[PDB]
Amino acid sequence: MFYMEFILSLIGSLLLIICVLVSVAFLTLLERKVLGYIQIRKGPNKVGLMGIPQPFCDAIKLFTKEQTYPLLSNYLSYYISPIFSLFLSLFVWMCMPFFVKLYSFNLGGLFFLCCTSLGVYTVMVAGWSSNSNYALLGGLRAVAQTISYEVSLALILLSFIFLIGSYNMIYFFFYQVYMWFLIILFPMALVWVSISLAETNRTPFDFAEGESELVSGFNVEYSSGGFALIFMAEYASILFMSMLFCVIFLGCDVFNLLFYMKLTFISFVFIWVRGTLPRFRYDKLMYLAWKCFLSFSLNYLLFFIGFKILLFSLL
Amino acid sequence: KWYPDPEFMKQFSGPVMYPDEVTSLWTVPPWNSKVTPVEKSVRNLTLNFGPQHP
């Protein structure tokens, strides 16, 4: 009955939270192994049996490591941002689609836009709390990157949204029931990888945390426990985008293991980029954001709007 | 004949034609009424890049 409904809804949310957290913490190893073999390294195979408990080992180190809090009175404000970031990276999951009702969450695309937007405030205030020009430059560069890409991200969404005829994500499954949707929108997939990669701040768009240009960007002044939360937040983010890529382009077959095979392959693909590409410049990226992607997205918008008008004409 | 003389032209010409303790104090008559900006010194940001830096 009714309270059966609510109890399960909370169990599912809680159950998903532990899984996504343990997955991303455990996924970190797969980055370290996989990148280890892109390079001709062997990757972690030392601790436990073949480095399986490597990420648990990492967490124990961090939580034991003290919290080298910055200048005297910043305690809270420096302690806020990691919470307010890991929260977004997790809670963004709850809109993800199921056939087995977790929610009746409509406007899921809008909610995606919103959560992906809120990352700016976390990084920016984090740098501001740190109060170190290195951290501050990182935040500004991080802010500019995310804010710029959201513009293209929105219009890109709309192409799919029109092609499915609603904002409810679930209809991606019904429209993909015959033939996958990548093979229709191939260029969008490459662009969407880049947009997703920009959001999660991975390379080639690695300006926010980065290395060798800023020490760690905003992350530079973060002690252990805060750092662990930021680091987990980023990987919860990289997984979610991998899921969103899977549900849009590659079948949305939530009740089929092949969907989870596809999750791993896409998250692998993110790493596959990590070990291959070099980094962009500031300005060249902004050209790529406004002068290249926005034009691209508008054309497809004007292309598919006509197509659906023609489609509506036919039926 | 009396003609408007510099005394008569000094009747006006304050920030207030009946100057008081404050208007008579400070005066700002830029005749053109178009005062050019005066450039400031925009000190830049300093970064001790390196040594601890890849």
TrEMBL record, chain A:
Q: Name where it's found.
A: Mitochondrion inner membrane
Entry's transmembrane regions: 6-27, 76-100, 107-127, 147-165, 177-195, 227-250, 257-275, 287-311
What are the entry keywords?
Membrane, Mitochondrion, Mitochondrion inner membrane, NAD, Transmembrane, Transmembrane helix, Transport, Ubiquinone
Cellular component terms per the entry's GO annotation: mitochondrial inner membrane
Membrane listed as a keyword: yes
Among HAMAP family, the record links this protein to: NDH1_NuoH (MF_01350)
Q: What protein name applies here? A: NADH-ubiquinone oxidoreductase chain 1
Native organism is Drosophila melanogaster
UniProtKB/TrEMBL annotation, chain B:
Q: Which domain of life is it from?
A: Eukaryota
**Similarity annotation:** Belongs to the complex I 49 kDa subunit family.
Q: What is this protein called?
A: Complex I-49kD
Q: What is the lineage of its organism?
A: Eukaryota, Metazoa, Ecdysozoa, Arthropoda, Hexapoda
Name the gene for this chain.
ND-49
